[PDB]
């Protein structure tokens, strides 16, 4: 598994070199913003259930076919599987966010996944949408939390978004 | 690749669990510690050239016979491959410093070490003595928590070789 | 148990069979110990439901789980952990003190996840359970090449269906078999009303 | 083991592998004889890069045969997008063109007939294009003139088997996949006794061809839509045949021009005699 | 019992390995974090009495009907067992604060929660609402990293109940 | 598994109580001395091999019967087992030292150990001695290390000793 | 899908064995029982409309507050999704009656029930009370072994929800 | 302990099977071979004294520096423990000769070798050079199949140490 430092190290090694002063300071900056990062990961963990629930309510509000017989979130067994997948993806997105690298998300969760859903007859476009809704709400929480020091978290909100967007793209 | 960050994530994943306060506290340690680590890294990085030549020589001064003909400290190629090897170790030490864990050392030098050294007739004693010397000189390039970090990883290599 | 009937899961299986195989695999790996619904490896159950993994590889994922590490590895001595892995994964007791030593040396050299893989990639696992059978208790039969003491040791490890392998009460974390193995001395505690 | 999700864990490049196993890797725990499950005759498993060399060695030893290795991440991006080609844009040639009308046709015939490989400017059939411009010939002849050309012979025929040639031929000339094993056979026997040229004519003078393209219409894709007297499984063959907009027929592949439609797959649609 | 210290030790043990710089960095996080944690702990400890009575009442104010006869917020024994239960939660929150991890919560309240609540006809909604209220008031007893810690664990309980 | 905090918590809970101001400050002091504790654990880790080696050289210097045929550290297989056990015990002592509690040592290492050795014919008094030698050298290292800030580590040296002494007592 | 027929076949298959007198005796039970089962099924089928409206209302009469604004028994969509859900239960009860086992209930309502209800804030108590009411009225639509069958499956759902 | 006899018996037992013509043919090999083996054994046995002193010295002649002060070929105790160790090897070679397999070598010298040598700072190179020398001299004590046997086992030790 990689994190943002480990990634630097692998690229340096492929040159046969000690880390460039370029790469050093990029990593010094990651340490600089790490308290904000911890709050951002904490924002997701602290509201995981609601993020999934709210995404869910809204997914089925839009796509009332999934909860009809014939639909891929019917009966209870399938809805529980769908709720479970929402949690799994939100979980690996939070891991990537602590790590500063998408690799755990791509390697353990996403990249593939599409071919699973294809065989499962699971409509990937609906799954992509559920991921887009989790993103909206998750970032909502990253931006408006309990008595965190005021500052600018937009860099981290972007990065979190790209992890949500990776997953969506990979699946649709 | 073992870092504080990857370790806590691995432990969460394997229990199917979001990162919680236990895991985020851990991560803060790694981030709080980065300054000392990275100071050690910068000092080891710019002195690399001489740290390597110092340790290479010390292998010959402690094992005089190595530099006689028919031996493995003789001729340009042995002495070249030696400098390179110590340089590999210092390189991974700096990586381990920067990474926040032994991962780079575990994955690129420790995994397989003995099998390789045994097939190629390379004695660990040389490498321990290279590292003992590097440890002596790093005593005056650093101090405080950067020195402790440098030491942690140098010693880690010496234990890997014993 | 006489011969317990081992559950084979076959392809194009609806679910009820998959739910029965999941229950059998959980009863085999964790004994009669309660597992919370929050403690279940929902990802592994979903992969098995999708036919994306074999029953063997579902057992590998369950045995590598942090829950199996907390209950059987962090709470128990290394020799008792090896006695329990042989019970859960292979359905048998250890034959010789040398078999416990080879697993202990592999554990010390290669770590936890490689010890678990060594039981599941064994030719003994493939020959007896294949890819699609849930492991079941076997030490109540004499197999060709099996030590006669394996029956008594399996009975000492197998306290009956009501037995909990996690029992913190004065014997359950102690090596029931290792005391005997090193030498010529004994039999297994029958909890002794049998 | 089958169709995968996700790539890497620590980091890797996952490759998914496929084999054919003996009862040596996988057997049931039954009382007699060692057998693997009949439906896992060829089995596939995704392994990260380090475990990969060790796995292949093991599989080969205990008897299996590796059929494929392909990175997992290639194989996660689905099946092709077909929107551009479900329903195409038809390109025809009028009596008395405005000249660049005729320019449109040539570029399209090229793309379609040659299967999206690049035809470089040294390469183009200039004398033949002269003919279409003057009327002289119609949009059918260039479809026939291009096919008998060396460039067509060379990238699609000379270096691959006849099974492949015919399968490409259906795609190019008719726009649809090959429906039956009989179609393959009926064609191979013709080439064998009347030569290459007679065999080329057989798709361009066919009733199926004539209905859809008539004579002034450039052959266009039509197999992603239901057709007549088409087995049902010929709509899955089309995915195997066309790999996306950026895909092409290409004889420059490292492995060479090869198939794409499994021979086993063709038989599912029926087997007879002759 | 899950703490940063027990987690790193567990991970070392399971690989048959001495604690290394990765694991000691982690531990430093837990120790550096103790001050904020323990401030939260002391504030939650001395306000316990009122935090409990505040949350108990709020369960009845949000679910008015509970306090009517024939219901589960009626009579001395129900209302007594309620105060006790919220008190159990606050108690384990302080323990988790002091311990440096969710262990006390995981072992004494989370393991088994749903089975118990389901057999006894106890709705999680009450308990979430007790905790939401406790979270509102703890906004003005603490601030900065002690508040973040208090929040971390209160929220952890709310997610355990959803 | 327990650490020094977890122990406090278990005793508090058995009273049905929030931690006593007594117990709180005992734990505040453990946090106070934690940098020293980290150096002490680091002293052992950084010299593990030599601690075992030096203990070993000295054990067989004293007890030359163990390395004769008939002896429990003969032939190579048995010596490797004995060297391995020295490492295992030094390991769990270091874990206890990071934890501030002996429980991991008692529960994962010492529990049943004596009866194992007796079953095996391993002379427990010799094993106890090997543990006493590891203690001498380990503490040596805790007390005289590389450029650590100068101060008083005697409290920690005592506590480390009791872990070595627990093991010895448990085994002999 | 669990029926007497599938169960005995499963048990034969798993021992690699032809169906024997044990298994065929079992099947005869399921076939002998079909008449009572299917009478229950027909009565529950034609009364479905009113059984559903009766139980829906009873959920509001037993939990009056549900029908106030801001609550989950308010507005067309909640009240619509409720009727639907009870209708799902009655539907699977009739299926279980016709099928000769709990399979349809196990596969389509029980598997996953709690996870779903917990994510969506649906209290089992409502559903138990819907079913208790349906059980009251089915007392006078059926009698004898058809009533026993209807009861068996209604009670099975109530236990699934406790 | 690995011998031809134990190996075939192990293979029979593990298939729950009486010894058959395959296994008895194997045993005949071991018995037919005993004469050459045991001649090697007797020659190595009576020359032991000098074979050991010859090899011990050769370790110092090939690694001159070992015999200087501060080194591991200096003082009575090192030089004593060396003779002993080579004597152990020759002893197990004779045992392996007499036993009809590598068992005695596998169980008493190979199992654990590297761990021990690594903890005690013993270089395999010495031991290989002791054995290479013993192999040189055994060229003129034996010939034919007794020499081949002696060689087989000496070489087996040298490969165990590389
Ligand atoms: C237990 C693991 C752990 C966490 C969670 C942690 C958080 C943490 N967040 C901090 C700051 C902060 N955190 C934020 C975060 C935000 N600002 C906003 O306006 C956004 C809503 C939000 C975006 C994510 C900001 C702006 C600061 C102050 C600037 C800084 O220190 O970087 C600080 C510095 C002290 C302070 O200023 O309060 C800490 C210690 N420390 C830890 O050890
Ligand atoms: C990524 C980390 C990494 C390490 C650490 C590494 C060690 C390493 N050292 C090697 C060789 C060598 N190593 C040395 C070492 C020395 N010679 C001397 O003068 C001194 C005594 C001593 C230095 C202290 C010598 C002489 C060789 C050549 C051995 C041979 O091929 O005969 C080789 C064999 C391949 C080769 O010939 O380069 C490896 C793999 N390789 C790696 O990839
Ligand atoms: C590596 C982490 C990981 C992921 C991501 C994962 C996905 C995954 N989702 C699955 C099923 C499923 N996934 C869903 C999800 C959905 N249904 C919908 O209609 C929605 C569009 C969507 C929810 C947003 C459903 C309904 C099933 C069950 C399909 C079936 O059995 O019919 C399965 C089959 C095994 C099973 O059912 O447990 C896998 C392996 N498994 C994993 O181990
Ligand atoms: C290590 C090699 C080995 C031996 C020697 C062995 C003995 C052995 N004999 C057994 C049973 C048995 N053994 C007998 C034998 C006899 N009954 C009589 O009346 C006669 C006096 C005698 C035959 C001469 C019987 C009848 C049983 C079954 C007892 C029962 O289940 O009631 C069992 C219980 C497991 C089983 O029934 O398969 C073992 C372990 N098992 C082994 O693995
Ligand atoms: C064969 C069928 C079977 C039975 C009967 C069974 C009993 C059994 N009860 C156990 C624990 C337990 N049993 C209880 C029961 C009670 N506590 C009380 O105070 C009450 C008096 C009583 C409830 C009426 C408790 C509290 C534990 C946990 C003890 C502990 O871990 O501290 C355990 C230890 C394993 C575990 O905790 O899961 C077993 C094996 N196990 C089985 O497999
Ligand atoms: C799911 C239930 C199930 C079926 C149906 C099944 C079929 C099956 N038949 C097999 C072999 C076989 N099947 C036959 C059958 C025949 N040979 C002939 O010439 C005849 C035409 C025919 C008998 C009518 C033979 C000879 C083999 C052995 C092939 C070999 O190993 O060379 C094997 C390979 C494993 C083994 O040999 O045990 C499978 C899996 N396995 C199953 O688990
Ligand atoms: C049937 C008998 C049998 C064979 C032959 C076998 C081969 C085999 N070699 C493997 C790996 C390997 N094999 C090698 C071998 C080499 N690396 C190099 O650079 C050299 C060119 C070459 C040595 C000459 C390496 C390095 C791996 C590990 C690959 C990895 O995990 O990255 C693996 C994957 C499983 C594992 O790592 O244990 C198998 C199955 N397995 C078997 O069971
Ligand atoms: C053997 C008799 C036979 C059948 C049954 C058959 C099915 C079939 N349907 C196809 C396409 C198609 N089928 C549909 C059908 C639908 N789209 C929807 O959204 C609806 C759910 C559904 C209509 C009810 C569509 C839209 C395509 C085109 C897909 C594409 O190219 O993107 C294709 C691909 C070839 C082509 O597009 O002509 C085949 C082979 N082909 C056959 O020869
Ligand atoms: C160590 C951690 C721990 C927790 C959290 C815990 C919860 C818990 N609450 C219980 C009962 C109860 N819990 C309540 C709760 C409430 N009543 C009200 O007025 C409010 C609506 C609500 C408070 C918000 C009630 C009324 C009972 C009595 C239930 C009964 O026996 O009927 C019981 C049953 C045993 C008993 O009757 O005491 C347990 C185990 N037990 C524990 O050991
Ligand atoms: C939980 C952590 C843990 C411990 C502590 C442990 C001890 C332990 N030591 C053992 C053997 C041994 N231990 C020794 C140790 C010694 N011999 C001496 O003469 C000295 C006095 C002493 C070294 C100081 C020896 C020689 C054996 C092998 C005994 C034999 O097989 O004959 C064995 C038998 C299994 C094996 O040989 O691998 C265990 C279980 N095992 C564990 O898993
Ligand atoms: C990577 C994990 C990690 C370690 C190892 C760590 C060590 C560490 N040891 C420290 C102090 C110290 N460490 C010692 C230790 C000793 N004094 C002696 O004379 C004895 C030889 C030795 C006994 C163990 C002393 C006396 C201090 C200064 C007083 C104090 O800060 O408590 C400090 C405070 C800064 C300083 O004064 O240097 C740190 C950060 N911090 C970490 O995050
Ligand atoms: C196949 C078997 C099956 C069952 C049993 C089932 C239950 C079920 N009920 C749901 C929602 C619901 N269920 C209710 C239930 C009620 N509201 C009221 O007025 C009453 C209090 C109560 C009826 C007693 C409500 C209000 C919702 C909407 C929840 C939401 O999305 O906020 C949902 C979420 C998807 C959706 O919004 O439709 C499921 C899956 N789904 C199934 O597929
Ligand atoms: C049963 C088979 C068996 C073998 C093979 C064996 C080897 C062996 N050699 C040892 C020591 C030793 N081995 C030597 C070897 C040498 N010194 C020299 O002058 C030469 C360079 C060299 C001979 C070629 C030395 C010097 C020691 C003492 C190491 C020490 O304790 O510092 C020890 C440590 C215990 C002890 O001090 O005796 C073992 C176990 N032990 C066994 O039980």
Q: Residue C178: list chain F partners with CB under 8 A.
A: 112, 116, 119
Residue H101 CA to ligand 13 centre (angstroms): 25
Which atom number of ligand 4 is nearest to the Cα of residue C142?
43
The binding site of F for (2R,3E)-phycocyanobilin consists of 35, 39, 72, 77-78, 82-88, 149, 151, 153
Ligand 11 shell residues, CB under 6 Å: B 33, 144-145, 148; E 21, 24-25, 28; F 35-36, 38-40, 42, 142-143, 145, 148-151, 153, 156
Please check whether residue D100 touches A, CB under 8 A: no
For residue G130, CA distances in Å to E70, F16, G46, G147 come to 19, 41, 18, 18
DSSP-derived 3-state class of residue B119: helix
The answer to whether residues E8 and B2 touch, using CB atoms and an 8 Å cutoff, is no
Q: With b meaning 16 or more CB within 10 Å and e meaning fewer, what string describes D18-43?
A: bbebbbebbbbbeeeeeebbeebeeb
Ligand 5 binding pocket includes C36 (Cβ within 6 Å): no
What the block records as the tokens of G6 is: 């599938």
Are G and C close enough to touch, i.e. 3+ CB pairs under 8 angstroms?
A: yes
For residue C4, CA distances in Å to C31, C126, E14 come to 14, 18, 33
Alpha carbons H29 and D52: distance in angstroms, whole number? 41
Cα end-to-end distance, chain D, whole Å: 40
Alpha carbons D139 and D134: distance in angstroms, whole number? 12
Cα angle, residue B133 at apex, residues B128 and B139 outer, rounded to 5°: 125
Cα end-to-end distance, chain B, whole Å: 23
CB atoms F77 and H115 under 8 Å: no
Ligand 13 binding pocket includes H120 (Cβ within 6 Å): yes
What the block records as the tokens of A162 is: 């790209």
Domains, chain F, with CATH or none: 1-172 (1.10.490.20)
Alpha carbons B81 and B56: distance in angstroms, whole number? 10
Q: Where are the alpha helices (DSSP H) in B1-144?
A: 4-13, 21-46, 48-62, 75-99, 103-105, 113-119, 124-137
Which residues 6+ apart lie within 8 Å of E29 measured at CB?
Answer: B4, B25, B26, B27, B28, B29, B30, B32, E4
CB atoms B6 and D11 under 8 Å: no
Q: Residue A81: list chain C partners with CB under 8 A.
A: 46, 49
H/E stretch holding D16 reads strand D14-20
What is the DSSP track for D190-259? HHHHHHHHHHHHHHHT-HHHHHHHTTTB-----TTS--TT--TTHHHHHHHH---TT----S--TT-S--
Q: Provide the angle, in degrees to the nearest 10, between the axes of the packed helices B124-137 and B145-160.
A: 170
Ligand 10 binding pocket includes F133 (Cβ within 6 Å): no
Which atom number of ligand 9 is nearest to the Cα of residue E79?
19
DSSP-derived 3-state class of residue G62: helix
Q: Which residue is closest in CA terms to ligand 11's atom 14?
A: F36
Radius of gyration of chain G from Cα atoms?
18
- Select the residue from A2, A4, A112 to test the D interface by mutation, using most D Cβ atoms within 10 A: A112
- C-alpha E134: how far from its chain's center? 10
Please check whether residue G18 touches A, CB under 8 A: no
Alpha carbons A82 and A70: distance in angstroms, whole number? 15
Please check whether residue A81 touches C, CB under 8 A: yes
The answer to whether residues C17 and A87 touch, using CB atoms and an 8 Å cutoff, is no
For E82, list phi and psi in degrees, rounded to 5: -75, -60
Residue D14 pairs in a beta bridge with D48
Alpha carbons G150 and G130: distance in angstroms, whole number? 15
Q: Which of B24, B98, B104 sits opposite A41 (nearest CB)?
A: B24
What the block records as the tokens of D103 is: 């320019």
Q: Where are the alpha helices (DSSP H) in chain G?
A: 4-13, 21-46, 48-62, 75-99, 103-105, 113-119, 124-137, 145-160
For B17, list phi and psi in degrees, rounded to 5: -140, 140
For residue D250, CA distances in Å to A167, D110, D124, D174, H132 come to 32, 14, 17, 19, 62
Q: Which ligand is nearest to the CA of D175?
A: 8
The answer to whether residues D143 and D109 touch, using CB atoms and an 8 Å cutoff, is yes
Alpha carbons B9 and F13: distance in angstroms, whole number? 30
Which residues 6+ apart lie within 8 Å of A40 measured at CB?
Answer: A97, A142, A153, A156, A157, A160
DSSP C11: S
Q: How far is A35 from chain E (nearest CA, A)?
A: 11
Q: How far is E101 from chain G (nearest CA, A)?
A: 26
Radius of gyration of chain A from Cα atoms?
18
For residue F167, CA distances in Å to A157, F106, H97, H143 come to 52, 8, 44, 57
Q: What is the 3-state secondary structure (H, E, C) of chain H?
A: CCCHHHHHHHHHHCCCCCCCHHHHHHHHHHHHHHHHHHHHHHHHHHCHHHHHHHHHHHHHHHCHHHHCCCCCCCHHHHHHHHHHHHHHHHHHHHHHHHHCCCHHHHHHHHCCHHHHHHHCCCCHHHHHHHHHHHHHHCCCCCCCHHHHHHHHHHHHHHHHCC
Q: Which ligand is nearest to the CA of C152?
A: 4
- C-alpha H120: how far from its chain's center? 21
- C-alpha C57: how far from its chain's center? 14
Q: Which of F52, F76, F83 sits opposite H111 (nearest CB)?
A: F76
CB atoms A2 and D11 under 8 Å: yes
The answer to whether residues C24 and C134 touch, using CB atoms and an 8 Å cutoff, is yes
Residue D49 CA to ligand 7 centre (angstroms): 12
Resolved by: cryo-EM
Helices and strands (H and E) in chain F: how many: 9, 0
Please check whether residue A108 touches C, CB under 8 A: no
Q: Which ligand is nearest to the CA of C36?
A: 5
Contacts for H16-21: CB closer than 8 Å, 24+ residues apart: H16/C143, H16/C144, H16/C145, H17/C144
DSSP F19: P
What residue spans define the domains of chain B? Answer: 1-162
DSSP-derived 3-state class of residue F111: coil
Pick the closest to residue D268 from D239, D244, D234, D245 (CA basis): D234
G81: annotated binding-site residue?
Answer: yes
For residue F128, CA distances in Å to A103, F59, F81 come to 49, 10, 15
For A73, list phi and psi in degrees, rounded to 5: -110, 30
Q: How far is B8 from chain C (nearest CA, A)?
A: 12
What the block records as the tokens of D106 is: 């040539």
Q: How crowded is residue D121: how many other Cβ atoms within 10 Å of its Cβ?
A: 7
The binding site of A consists of 35, 39, 72, 77-78, 82-88, 149, 151, 153
Q: Which of C7, C15, C37 sits opposite G14 (nearest CB)?
A: C7
User: Best of D31, D35, D41, D42 to mutate for ligand 6, by most ligand atoms within 8 A of CB?
Assistant: D35
Q: Residue B144: list chain F partners with CB under 8 A.
A: 147, 149
User: Best of D81, D183, D225 to mutate for ligand 8, by most ligand atoms within 8 A of CB?
Assistant: D225
Alpha carbons C7 and B72: distance in angstroms, whole number? 62
Nearest residue in H to C144, CA atom: H16
H/E stretch holding D68 reads strand D66-71
Cα angle, residue F95 at apex, residues F89 and F101 outer, rounded to 5°: 105
Please check whether residue C143 touches H, CB under 8 A: yes
CB atoms A95 and B19 under 8 Å: yes
Cα end-to-end distance, chain A, whole Å: 25
For residue G78, CA distances in Å to F52, G82, G116 come to 71, 6, 16
Q: How crowded is residue H146: how many other Cβ atoms within 10 Å of its Cβ?
A: 22
Q: How many angstroms is the resolution?
A: 2.8
Alpha carbons G60 and G79: distance in angstroms, whole number? 10
CA neighbours closer than 13 Å in the CB half-sphere of residue F106: 12
Residue G81 CA to ligand 12 centre (angstroms): 5
For residue H24, CA distances in Å to D143, H20, H64 come to 78, 6, 51
Alpha carbons C143 and H10: distance in angstroms, whole number? 14
Residue D46 pairs in a beta bridge with D16
- What size, in residues, is chain B? 162
Residue G67 CA to ligand 8 centre (angstroms): 48
Alpha carbons C115 and C68: distance in angstroms, whole number? 13
Q: How far is E68 from chain B (nearest CA, A)?
A: 39
**Given a contact as 3+ CB pairs under 8 Å, which chains touch D?**
A, B, C
H/E stretch holding D48 reads strand D42-48
Please, what CATH class does the domain formed by E1-162 belong to?
Answer: mainly alpha
Q: What is the 3-state secondary structure (H, E, C) of C138-169?
A: CCCCCCCCCCCHHHHHHHHHCCCCCCCCCCCC
The answer to whether residues B126 and B56 touch, using CB atoms and an 8 Å cutoff, is no
Residue C12 gets the label, from left (phi > 0), alpha (psi -120 to 50) or beta, of: left
Q: What is the 3-state secondary structure (H, E, C) of C43-83?
A: HHHHHHHCCCCCHHHHHHHHHHCHHHHHHHHCCCCHHHHHH
What is the DSSP track for D171-199? IIIISS----HHHHHHHHHHHHHHHHHHH
Please check whether residue E126 touches F, CB under 8 A: no
The overall longest dimension of chain B from CA atoms, in Å, is 62
Nearest residue in A to D75, CA atom: A112
Q: Which ligand is nearest to the CA of C93?
A: 4
The answer to whether residues E9 and F1 touch, using CB atoms and an 8 Å cutoff, is yes
Alpha carbons C181 and D245: distance in angstroms, whole number? 69
Q: Following CA atoms C174, C180, C186, C191 in sequence, which dihedral angle do they give, to the nearest 10 degrees?
A: 10
DSSP G110: I
Are F and E close enough to touch, i.e. 3+ CB pairs under 8 angstroms?
A: yes
DSSP-derived 3-state class of residue D66: strand
The binding site of A for (2R,3E)-phycocyanobilin consists of 35, 39, 72, 77-78, 82-88, 149, 151, 153
């Amino acid at each position: 598994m990689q994190d943002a430092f480990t990634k630097a190290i692998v690229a340096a090694d492929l040159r046969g070199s000690f880390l460039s002063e370029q790469e050093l300071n990029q990593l010094t900056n990651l340490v600089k913003e790490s308290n904000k990062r911890l709050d951002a990961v904490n924002a997701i963990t602290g509201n995981a259930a609601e993020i999934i629930s709210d995404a869910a309510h809204k997914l089925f509000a839009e796509q009332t076919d999934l909860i009809r017989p014939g639909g891929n979130a019917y009966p209870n067994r399938r809805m529980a599987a769908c709720l479970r997948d929402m949690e799994i993806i939100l979980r690996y997105v939070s891991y990537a966010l602590l790590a500063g690298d998408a690799s755990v998300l791509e390697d353990r969760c996403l990249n593939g996944l599409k071919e699973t859903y294809v065989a499962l007859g699971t409509p990937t476009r609906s799954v992509a949408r559920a991921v887009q809704l989790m993103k909206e709400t998750a970032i909502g929480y990253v931006n408006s939390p309990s008595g965190v020091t005021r500052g600018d978290c937009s860099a981290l909100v972007n990065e979190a978004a790209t992890y949500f967007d990776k997953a969506a793209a990979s699946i649709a | 690749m073992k870092t504080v960050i990857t370790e806590v994530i691995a432990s969460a994943d394997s229990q199917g669990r979001f990162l919680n306060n236990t895991e985020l506290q851990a991560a803060n340690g790694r981030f709080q510690r980065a300054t000392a680590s990275m100071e050690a890294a910068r000092a080891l990085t710019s002195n690399a050239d001489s740290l390597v030549k110092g340790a290479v020589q010390e292998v010959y001064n402690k094992f005089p016979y190595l530099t006689q003909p028919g031996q493995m400290g003789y001729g340009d190629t042995n002495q070249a491959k030696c400098a390179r090897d110590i340089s590999h170790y210092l390189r991974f030490i700096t990586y381990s410093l920067v990474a926040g864990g032994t991962g780079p050392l575990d994955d690129y030098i420790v995994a397989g070490l003995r099998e390789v050294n045994r097939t190629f007739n390379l004695s660990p004693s040389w490498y321990i003595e290279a590292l003992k010397h590097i440890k002596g000189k790093v005593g005056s390039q650093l101090s405080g928590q950067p020195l402790t970090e440098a030491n942690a990883y140098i010693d880690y290599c010496i234990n890997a070789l014993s | 148990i006489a011969p317990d009937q081992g559950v084979e899961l076959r392809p194009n299986f609806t679910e009820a069979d998959v739910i029965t195989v999941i229950r059998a695999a959980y009863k085999q790996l964790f004994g009669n110990t309660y597992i919370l619904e929050s403690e279940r490896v929902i990802q592994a159950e979903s992969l098995l439901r999708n036919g994306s993994i074999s029953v063997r590889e579902f057992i590998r994922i369950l045995a590598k789980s942090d829950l199996y590490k907390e209950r059987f590895f962090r709470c128990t001595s290394n020799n008792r952990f090896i006695e329990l892995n042989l019970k859960h994964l292979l359905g048998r007791a250890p034959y010789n003190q040398g078999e416990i030593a080879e697993h202990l040396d592999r554990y010390c050299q290669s770590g936890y996840d490689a010890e678990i893989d060594s039981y599941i990639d064994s030719d003994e696992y493939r020959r007896v359970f294949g890819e699609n059978t849930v492991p079941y208790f076997r030490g109540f039969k004499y197999q060709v090449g099996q030590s006669a003491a394996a029956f008594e040791r399996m009975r000492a490890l197998y306290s009956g269906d009501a037995g909990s392998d996690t029992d913190r009460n004065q014997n359950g974390q102690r090596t029931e078999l290792t005391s005997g193995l090193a030498d010529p001395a004994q039999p297994v505690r029958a909890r002794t009303d049998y | 083991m089958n169709v995968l999700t996700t790539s890497s864990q620590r980091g890797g490049k996952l490759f998914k592998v496929t084999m054919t196993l003996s009862p040596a890797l996988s057997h049931h725990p039954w009382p007699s004889l060692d057998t693997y499950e009949p439906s896992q005759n060829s089995y596939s498993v995704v392994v990260p890069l380090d475990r990969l060399l060790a796995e292949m060695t093991y599989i080969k030893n205990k008897g299996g045969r590796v059929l494929d290795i392909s990175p997992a991440d290639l194989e996660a991006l689905g099946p092709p997008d077909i929107s551009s080609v479900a329903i195409p844009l038809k390109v025809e040639l009028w009596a008395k063109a405005d000249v660049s009308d005729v320019q449109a046709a040539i570029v399209a015939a090229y793309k379609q007939i040659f299967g999206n490989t690049y035809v470089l400017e040294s390469e183009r059939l200039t004398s033949a294009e002269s003919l279409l411009r003057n009327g002289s010939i119609s949009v059918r002849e260039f479809v026939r003139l291009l096919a008998k050309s060396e460039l067509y012979k060379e990238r699609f025929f000379f270096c691959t088997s006849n099974n492949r040639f015919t399968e490409l031929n259906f795609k190019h000339f008719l726009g649809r996949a090959p429906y039956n094993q009989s179609e393959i056979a009926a064609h191979l026997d013709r080439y064998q006794t009347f030569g290459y040229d007679a065999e080329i004519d057989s798709y361009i003078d066919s009733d199926e061809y004539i209905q859809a393209f008539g004579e002034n219409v450039v052959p266009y894709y039509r197999g992603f839509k239901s057709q007549s007297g088409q087995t049902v499984e010929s709509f899955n063959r089309m995915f195997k045949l066309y790999r996306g907009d950026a895909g092409s027929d290409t004889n420059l592949n490292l492995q060479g021009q090869k198939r794409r439609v499994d021979p086993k797959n063709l038989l599912r649609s029926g087997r007879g005699i002759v």
